[PDB]
Amino acid sequence: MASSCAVQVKLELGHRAQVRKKPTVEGFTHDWMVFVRGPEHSNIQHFVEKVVFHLHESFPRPKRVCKDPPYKVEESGYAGFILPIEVYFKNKEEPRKVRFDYDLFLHLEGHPPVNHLRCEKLTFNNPTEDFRRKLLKA
Template sequence: MLKSSDESEKKNLARKVKDSEIGVPIVYGNIAFWLGKKASEYQSHKWTVYVRGAGNEDLGVVIKRAVFQLHSSFNNPTRIVESPPFELSESGWGEFEIIITLHFHSDVTDNPLHLYHHLKLYPGDESGPMSTKKPVVVESYDEIVFLEPSEGFLSRVKNHPAVIVPRLPADIILPPVPMEDVDKRKRGDANDHPLSQWFDNFSEADELLILAGARQQVQAQIARLRRQLSLVDGQPPQLKAASDL
């Protein structure tokens, strides 16, 4: 029995690309604004909990919807967000754990992903007193990895800024991307988000600078300890290049 062209096309789109993976860097967390003089006993903060791209890109190309499970004291504690930005804003006074469940498009995976975030409203001791001008921001970085993605998924996201796509072998020819997906991909950058000025920067270049700075501090501390040990032993300290430490 011959299959229709539509069935054949669906089969090709669902075919797995072996020995490959797609990475999607994400950031999830919350931002909380103290209400100051407007604060009441039960309404001291306005807050937003969210899942975003590491560079604040639109994750709608991968995520179909996000479900936020709030504390049972809230009206309708299960909140469903069907489209990006995947965020939820509320007000209150207490801190609690929020379960964030991500559901993906059908060509990505049928398995949801559960994230756990503890809502933080109040600054730590090192952050100073509460301020209406500077919000409390708590974020976590992670990367979702999809092993052996389908050809349809890979073709749809291969040039999207929110997705890390591997270099493919020359013999793999991906199917064309539907026009509606091309339009969505052009809208993938969401850096004009109203809260973006408060978001942490998780770019790879910044992370490398932080690691380099930490390495220099460790090397300097090792050099100081070696000098102290040499003085205790009565031997002159030996000079070494930083790369040898």
Template sequence: MSKPEENSEEKESAQILNKKLKDVEISIPIVYGNIAFWLGKMSNEYQSHKWTIYVRGATNEDLGVVIKRAVFQLHSSFNNPTRVIEAPPFELSEAGWGEFEIAIALYFHSDVCDKPLNLYHHLKLYPEDEPGPVSIKKPVVVESYDEIVFPEPSEGFLARVQSHPAVNLPRLPAGFTLPPPMPVEDTSKRKRGDTKDSPLAQWFMKFSEADKLLQLAAARQQVQAHIAKLRRQISLINGQNQHLKSPSNQ
């Protein structure tokens, strides 16, 4: 059974959306880590803590606009140690007694990137350098800040996230017009995925370095936009010089 061919307008539209933008970067600040609660009198030798491993937006915004699914690889002693989270919030809760390294694979939407990003987090259950008895009310919180950078994004990707608060966008060249925003795949099946109202949000860390890193990212994007402008000016000057040197003008 043959597949209908795309008409010329559809092909042209797809080519525009897939066009890569030179000298442009999109960055997404993220935080990944775990929160662990001691179970107190309810604990036993096999389950001393209840914990949650997660990947969240640095300001608790919904990451579903960029990330399609997250895969958490737990210790082999767990039932079904490979856990797949298909929609935000990208988090997983379990109970146990031991600390171990968790591999996290982030898969992106088709117009973002075709390769997963691999992260690693060492699950922490017990506090370090804290005097006194362990509390059932105050959890152990261990988080890491990072920034995912996508160089030369497609026009479709840039258009889709242009107004999303979780994404840092570059300053575009003057006169550049983005195509209409495109919806995320299966948007009708997606729920609100930010973590602002999460019951764990009160324990999330606020990174003093995050603002500086975001400022550096914004400054880098401005420099790149300036470099792109200079390259266009140099190209224009070279073109004029070639025209002056052509035989027809001698």
């Protein structure tokens, strides 16, 4: 077999974070949202099984699973933290997933709200036929 194939897929990870007009009861000062998606409204669900957001252990039910888009978690809290994100693929072969350690940072009041975007490129070398087709629908 003398052919080979590299498939690349572009993801966007990001988050928004806003100082709340008034803290919640529990002392939560900020609202935030974090997300994984395709650039330009592309559909990554073709090859993505699920996204797992691992929230800091201070949160109830810290392991947030999204089986369907939008792949995101919306929360309120008092501090940033490093938020492991696992993107699982619709394949049956390595790699089954990829992990990003997402820096979920807040700004203090006085500073503008956070709107952060992090671009990531995945490369799959010689995926199976099934998977290759899934990737290339995205």
